[PDB]
Amino acid sequence: MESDLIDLFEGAKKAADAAALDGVTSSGPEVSQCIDALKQLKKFPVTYDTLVATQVGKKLRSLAKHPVEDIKSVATDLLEIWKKVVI
């Protein structure tokens, strides 16, 4: 469902943002929560109209430019998967 997509992305962004603002390293819990949230999103069968209505795809670019490399890498991977799914 789209509500689940939105909720999972909100969790991921909250985590990534606490990690960036609290100066957390890769071994921090916020990074782990963001990583997990981003991994669950991979399994979501997103569609084009879903990405239009929710904009989660657009909003994931920010995470793909996160200062923590672990979050950035997993966000790039999530975008890579969704890419092949929607086109």
Swiss-Prot record:
Knockout consequences: Reduced seed dormancy and increased germination rate of freshly harvested seeds. Early flowering.
Tissue-level expression: Expressed in roots, leaves and flowers.
Residues where N-acetylmethionine is found: M1
Domain TFIIS N-terminal: 10-87
Subcellular location: Nucleus
Domain of life: Eukaryota
Cited function: Necessary for efficient RNA polymerase II transcription elongation past template-encoded arresting sites. Involved in the control of seed dormancy and germination.
Protein name: Transcription elongation factor TFIIS
Species: Arabidopsis thaliana
Gene transcribed to yield this protein: TFIIS
